[PDB]
Design a protein around this ligand. Structure first.
Ligand SMILES: O=C(O)[C@H]1O[C@@H](O[C@H]2[C@H](O)[C@H](O)[C@H](O)O[C@@H]2C(=O)O)[C@@H](O)[C@@H](O)[C@@H]1O
Length: 226
């Protein structure tokens, strides 16, 4: 009794270029599975046509991982001259009690390091400034450095919001509803790495391991160019 996101043509291309991971890193549905009507409590189309991801547990995820239509995994040069762009229209609902951070978009390297996470956070303190209920960009400072540079992008709203990630020439930019909120952040620390996009709900440090994080996407696409 779940409608598949594949029933909406606006998702055909991204699903053809994705695989779904749930609840950890193992793939539960490949592109062909997704295109053939895959749907479950953790991944389904709502009545008003959002692709909704839902998951409970610490560091558990319901997440799409960028793929090539060939079936190759996406593995583009993180710092190369070819622009890689991810665009999404995301409605972040008020999260259930005990949900503290939910990652909704990533640039991830082809090993174990997220280059960028865009996440909702209940709270965050950056250089002495605490912000409540915001959308955050987190860029890891290196593969061998567990620390990250964090940037507030937006006050959380339930309204559908346009996010754009543009990666090119060792820099990364983020726009929110068309306004630049992170302007050519350096990611040269991933020279020599390959990268891919992810999108969905990835539940970070919940205080209630039973609560469900929940994220809705009205549009989603990832492209490259030159
Ligand atoms: O909480 C920390 O100690 C560090 O977490 C970092 O983000 C994590 C994130 O919580 C997820 O587990 C993800 O899978 O891996 C990320 C990682 O880079 O290890 C950063 O938030 C960092 O600022 C924290 O120091």
């Amino acid at each position: 009794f779940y409608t598949a996101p594949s029933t909406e043509s606006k998702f055909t291309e991204v699903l053809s270029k994705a695989k779904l991971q749930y609840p950890t890193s193992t793939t539960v549905a490949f592109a062909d599975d997704l295109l053939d009507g895959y749907a479950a409590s953790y991944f389904y189309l709502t009545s008003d046509l959002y692709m909704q991801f839902q998951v409970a547990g610490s560091s558990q995820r319901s997440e799409l991982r960028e793929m090539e239509t060939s079936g190759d995994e996406a593995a583009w040069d993180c710092t190369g001259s070819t622009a890689h762009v991810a665009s999404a229209q995301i409605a972040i609902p008020v999260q259930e009690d005990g949900i503290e951070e939910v990652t909704i978009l990533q640039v991830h390297d082809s090993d174990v390091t997220p280059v960028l996470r865009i996440s909702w956070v209940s709270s965050i303190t950056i250089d002495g400034v605490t912000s409540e209920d915001v959308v955050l960009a987190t860029i890891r400072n290196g593969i061998d450095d567990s620390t990250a540079t964090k940037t507030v992008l937006q006050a959380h709203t339930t309204s559908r919001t346009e996010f754009n990630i543009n990666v090119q020439n060792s820099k990364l930019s983020i726009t929110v509803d068309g306004t630049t909120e992170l302007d050519e952040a350096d990611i040269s620390q991933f020279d020599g790495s390959t990268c891919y996009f992810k999108a969905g709900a990835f539940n970070n440090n919940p205080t209630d391991t039973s609560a469900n994080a929940r994220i809705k996407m009205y549009e989603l696409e990832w492209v490259d160019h030159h």
